[PDB]
Amino acid sequence: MRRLKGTIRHLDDQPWINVSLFLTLINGTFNSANQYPIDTKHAKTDQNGEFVFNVVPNVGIDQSYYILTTPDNKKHSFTVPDGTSDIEFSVVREAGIIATDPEYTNVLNYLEDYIDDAIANIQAS
Amino acid sequence: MRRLKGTIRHLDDQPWINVSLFLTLINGTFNSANQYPIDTKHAKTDQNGEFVFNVVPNVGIDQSYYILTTPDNKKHSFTVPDGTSDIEFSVVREAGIIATDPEYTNVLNYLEDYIDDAIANIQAS
Amino acid sequence: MRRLKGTIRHLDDQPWINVSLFLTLINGTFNSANQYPIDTKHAKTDQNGEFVFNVVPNVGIDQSYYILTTPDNKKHSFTVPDGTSDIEFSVVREAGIIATDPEYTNVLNYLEDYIDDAIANIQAS
Amino acid sequence: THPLESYYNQFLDGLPTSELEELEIEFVAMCIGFPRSQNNFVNALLDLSTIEVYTIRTSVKEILRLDKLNKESIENRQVTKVEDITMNMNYIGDIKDELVTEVKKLARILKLPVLDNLYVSYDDVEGRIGAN
Amino acid sequence: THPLESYYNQFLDGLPTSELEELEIEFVAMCIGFPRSQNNFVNALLDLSTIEVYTIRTSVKEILRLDKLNKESIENRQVTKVEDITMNMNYIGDIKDELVTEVKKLARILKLPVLDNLYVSYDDVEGRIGAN
Amino acid sequence: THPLESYYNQFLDGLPTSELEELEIEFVAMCIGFPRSQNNFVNALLDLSTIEVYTIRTSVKEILRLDKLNKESIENRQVTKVEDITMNMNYIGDIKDELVTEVKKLARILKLPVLDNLYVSYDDVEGRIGAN
Amino acid sequence: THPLESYYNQFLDGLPTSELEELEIEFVAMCIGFPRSQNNFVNALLDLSTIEVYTIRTSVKEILRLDKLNKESIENRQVTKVEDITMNMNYIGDIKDELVTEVKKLARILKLPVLDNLYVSYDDVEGRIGAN
Amino acid sequence: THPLESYYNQFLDGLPTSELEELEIEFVAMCIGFPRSQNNFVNALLDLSTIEVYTIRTSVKEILRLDKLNKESIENRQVTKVEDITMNMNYIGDIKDELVTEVKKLARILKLPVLDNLYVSYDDVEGRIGAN
């Protein structure tokens, strides 16, 4: 649930207020913890032109490809990296789709923990 | 019969409360001591967004195979592993979704490489 | 005669209570003592999904062919062998289908891995 | 793909006859205009025989098929008698009337009066519970 | 793949005159809108001569055939006089009229007052019982 | 198929003139709705002349043939003048008229009035007993 | 590129039945002129079943498609029977009728009265609260 | 190169949903004959939602397109049926009707009375304020 402290600003350098920004997920993403089906949500710029989104990183089969639609209706593609910290929009805006997080170790490691359970079942209780 | 658990939460990570979910076995299956025709079951998510289905360990004489339809109109295909124990829906939703990548000879090679990974783990074990 | 025994259960251990079934000696037959012309018999499920049919074993001079229709219309052919004792439906018919698809054994390979683990444990000693 | 479309596509050999599904129950509720919580509606949902269930299912399959057909045709009517094939301009009216007939068939299967729903208009019985 | 269609598919040298199975009794009940439990209905089900049963089964088979034929034909009517083959634009009307004719034929066989059902409309004598 | 169909198929050299078999009596009762129990009907069978028997069987055979033809013809009526052959759109009506004429012949041979039965509809003669 | 158009383009296989996005709610209010503040409107969203939501989304997609086709087709109508293709001069009327049908279906799914909106004018029910 | 057209052609992927610029507001004011300074007009300009603005801009673009198409086509009507292409003689009437439809659509979006403007005639409801 990384924040996104993105801020928009008019050409005159004043901010936009109560203007709709749309954020859309493309691939139904999921992790061992939970599942994140394809959903979209909007936000309104504050009186000062800031806007915040709480988003999930990309750990699914396909990257949890996010798109931001701005008031001009341009579509900006991007891919939330992993971590826990408020993010500025532009930094991920310039960064398109990337290789997201390490390859599978967690599920097979859970299987291997089950194998360890079996190992403990070999002799002892 | 195993229990398929699943945590579904919105893009903001808040849970979906009392939202609809459907599941259905595609082909009737029969065990040596009972016959299970096709059936469909509906469910709703709790306050925490969780949902649990009592489901057959589907291994059987005939083609046993489940499809779960989520609120995003998306149908995920998966077959339940045998056993008597609760399983998190993500595990099958990913393992059953490797049926994707038609003729997954590349992912079949990865399956063999995972057998090798288990072999090396045992060797270290 | 024989008491064809059968049990139907829902996807989640609930007996298939109060549903209909039909069986027909599709090929009208006869025996020296009596003649058994083509006919259809209907029945209903009990609170446990059990159902019993008093049926003539296939010892007809020419042919005695039975066909049973499930709630899903998965018409299963069979021919009750001679004898007087009862017999379960899973046995009278058997006659499983090839169940050929990428998603039939997709997880049966996982159970194959589990039995590989079991043999590894056994040979560990 | 409509949910019911896939669900029924699962059963190539005829249609299942066990019981009405909450999805099918909701669909009939919607296309007859009954909120499914009505006591009379649920009462009608009991005692219905198997062949009645089969007829309901084929009728709803017909409803879906005709509804889909209503969409692709509208791209036509842009033309009449292209080279020799004259067009039955009332095709739209025909399919609308067919949908109305199917809804009436549902209403008669349930033994209930057909109320105000999307497909039918001004031809309804006893309003909510009591009327006309 | 209708249950009665499958049941009939077995008999090729004719349709058996044994009696009316619960499924076909139920289907007839639905076709004339009579709840099968109604005393008058079951009483009429008694004293059935063999050829009466044969005719009833033939009429039921015809009902099924006409229903399927309507399902097929609805797609037609898209056009009229494709090259030189003009289309009977009331063909669907003809099918419906023949269907209601068969329904009334059944009702006449059972001497019962044809009532509100899925096929006939606005001409259902005596309603449920005694009054229409 | 139809029992009477086979029974008559046996008699290639015309049809017998002995008397009306139980199936024939049953089908006559069906065609004019006179339950064979009704004495006013049974007495009619008595004293029935030979040539009358032959004519009755001829009429019954024709009724069966016309019924089969009516069932078959419905596949037509889709179109008109496919290449140069325009078809009588009233053919089915002609078949119905012939059927009612045949049942009227049946009733006439027995000096009995036609009642509401399988074929004749809404134009009945002297009801169940006495005028309508 | 309408926003909801792309939003639906994402949902390639059918459409979700989760809720109505603020854009979808706004578009509905636009179609039937119900400001979202109206409790009589918001309560309609409450207790709104799933298949109902699917139908709403289907109707909205149809509204968008038909509206776009309306603007597209205007450049036609310049001529009649260019070579052998005579075109329905009422085609625009046909799509107008389709659009009003769609908005009426919308209003009826929510059991709400269709008021003066951008697509229907002076042919509507109940106006503000009880106007008509 | 209409100023509004030169503003719009930049936003190829849909149209912006920010707000109405003084140019867009001026154009709308002209199209419904409302001087901008009118208090009711500006008050209506508030409470504007996203899809409302988007549809307003789409309708304005359509207004411009049809207006240009009118001057394009007026050269036509000089002839009829060149070789086989008959000419829709009321086509200009269709253009006018669609244009006034768009103007009324805008009026409904703003909930404001449509008054005497440059496009529509005699559809002047309750004058500047209530008048006539």
How many angstroms separate the CA atoms of B97 and B66, rounded?
12
User: Looking at residue D70, what DSSP letter applies?
Assistant: H
Nearest residue on chain C to E18, alpha-carbon basis: C39
What element of type H or E holds B104? none
Strand partners, A22: A42, A69
Cα–Cα distance for residue pair D55/E2, rounded to 1 Å: 9
- Using alpha carbons, select from D92, H110, D103, D116 the residue that is nearest to residue G114: D116
Q: Are C9 and C47 in contact (CB under 8 A)?
A: no
Q: Do the chains H and E touch each other, judged by at least 3 C-beta pairs below 8 angstroms?
A: no
* Residue whose tokens read 């409801």: H125
D127-to-D33, D113, D114, D130 alpha-carbon distances in Å: 10, 9, 8, 6
Containing C29, the helix (H) or strand (E) segment is strand C29-30
For residue B25, give the nearest of C11, C107, C109 by CB distance: C11
Distance from CA of D15 to the nearest CA of G (A): 21
Helices H22-31 & H50-73, crossing angle to 10 degrees? 60
What's the rounded Cα separation, in Å, for the pair G95 and C77? 54
Interface contact flag, G13 B75, Cβ < 8 Å: yes
Distances (CA, A) of E82 to D92, E73, G91: 19, 16, 22
DSSP state letters, E47-96: S--HHHHHHHHHHHHHHHHHHHHHHHHTT--SEE-SSS-EE-TTHHHHHH
The pair of structure tokens assigned to F51 is 């040539």
CB-count burial class (<10 Å; 0-12, 13-18, 19+) for H93: exposed
**In terms of DSSP bridges, do strands A6-7 and A50-51 run parallel, antiparallel, or are they unpaired?**
antiparallel
> Do the bridges between strand C76-78 and strand C40-44 make them parallel or antiparallel, or are there none, so unpaired?
unpaired
Nearest CA distance, C2 vs chain B (angstrom): 18
DSSP, residue by residue, D15-66: ---S---HHHHHHHHHHHT--TT-HHHHHHHSS--HHHHHHHHHHHHHHHHH
The chain D residue lying nearest B71, using CA atoms, is: D3
From CA B50, how far away is CA B88, in angstroms rounded?
11
Q: Do chains D and B have 3 or more beta-carbon pairs under 8 angstroms?
A: yes
Is residue C87 within 8 A of residue C94, CB to CB? The reply is: no
Q: Which chains contact E through at least 3 pairs of Cβ atoms less than 8 Å apart?
A: C, D, F
B65:C11 CB<8 A: no
End-to-end CA separation in angstroms for chain D: 38
Q: Does C20 touch chain D (CB under 8 A)?
A: yes
> What is the experimental method?
cryo-EM
DSSP code at position E36: T
The span from the CA of E85 to the CA of F82, in Å, is 4
B10 with A39: Cβ contact below 8 A: yes
Whether E18 contacts chain C with CB within 8 A: yes
Nearest chain C residue (CA) to B52: C12
Rounded to whole angstroms, the Cα distance separating G30 from B52 reads: 40
User: Two tokens at B116?
Assistant: 């090798």
Q: Report the C-alpha gap between B77 and B69 in whole angstroms.
A: 9
CA–CA gap between residue B124 and residue A83 (Å, rounded): 32
Provide the β-strand partners of residue A7: A50
Q: Which of E89, E92, E90 is nearest to E73 (CA)?
A: E92
Torsion on CA atoms G1, G4, G10, G11, rounded to nearest 10: -140
* Closest by CA position to B66, among listed E67, C106, D31: C106
Q: Is A69 on the interface with G (CB under 8 A)?
A: yes
Cα angle: H30, vertex H33, H35; to 5 degrees? 80
Among H18, H19, H23, H26, residue whose Cα is nearest residue H6: H23
CA-to-CA separations, H128 to D14, H38, H41, H112, H131, in angstroms, rounded: 66, 9, 11, 10, 6
Phi/psi at C25 (5° precision): -75, 85
Given an 8 Å threshold on Cβ–Cβ distance, is E84 in contact with F81? Answer: yes
Q: Residue D128 in 3-state DSSP?
A: coil
Contact H98 G89 (CB under 8 A): no
* Chain A residues with beta carbon closer than 8 angstroms to that of H15: 73
CB contact under 8 A, B73 and G16: yes
Chains touching chain C, criterion 3+ CB pairs below 8 Å: A, B, D, E
Can you tell me the distance from the alpha carbon of D23 to that of D3, in angstroms, rounded to the nearest whole number?
8
Which residues of chain D lie closer than 8 angstroms to E116, CB-CB? 108
| Cβ neighbour number for residue D16 with a 10 Å cutoff | 24
Nearest-angstrom CA–CA distance, G114 and F66 = 55
Chains that touch G (3 or more CB pairs under 8 A): A, B, D, H
Phi, psi angle pair for B42, to nearest 5°: -100, 155
Distance from CA of E85 to the nearest CA of F (A): 4
Q: Distance (Å, rounded) from C-alpha H22 to C-alpha H24? A: 6
What is the rounded CA–CA span in Å between residue E14 and residue E6?
A: 14
Q: What is the dihedral of CA C23, C25, C30, C31, to 10 degrees?
A: -50
The answer to whether the CB atoms of G1 and H13 lie below 8 A apart is yes
Token representation of residue G120:
């229907």
Joined tokens for residue E28:
């007839």
- Token digits for H58? 């789409």
Stretch 76-95 of chain D: residues touching chain E, C-beta under 8 Å: 76, 84-88, 91, 94-95
Nearest to E85 among F4, F82, F116 (CB): F82
- Residue keyed to tokens 């044994």: E18
Task: Kindly state whether D3 is in contact with chain B, defined as any CB-CB distance less than 8 angstroms.
Answer: yes
Nearest to G1 among A24, A26, A73 (CB): A73
Contact A26 G10 (CB under 8 A): yes
DSSP tag of H112: P
Residue A51 corresponds to which tokens in the numbers above?
């806007």
The span from the CA of C52 to the CA of C43, in Å, is 9
To the nearest whole Å, the CA of B72 is away from the closest chain G CA by 4
The answer to whether the beta carbons of residues E115 and E127 sit under 8 Å apart is yes
Q: Measure Cα distances from G97 to C28, C37, D74, G101, G102 in Å.
A: 60, 61, 11, 6, 9
Rounded distance between C-alpha atoms, residue C116 and residue F21, angstroms? 77
The DSSP-derived string for C59-103 is --SS--EEEEE-TT---EEE-PPS-SS-EEHHHHH-------STT
Which is it for the CA torsion B110, B114, B115, B119, positive or negative? positive
- Cβ separation C96–B1 shorter than 8 A: no
Find residues 19-58 of chain D whose CB sits inside 8 Å of chain G. Answer: 23, 26-27, 29-30, 33, 36
Tell me whether chains H and C touch (3+ CB pairs under 8 A): no
What count of CB pairs under 8 Å joins C to E? 18
Residues in chain E with CB shorter than 8 Å from the CB of D55 are 30, 118
- DSSP code of C44? E
* Interface residue E22 vs chain C (CB under 8 A): yes
C124: nearest CA partner in chain A: A122
Strand segments, DSSP code E, in chain G are 79-80
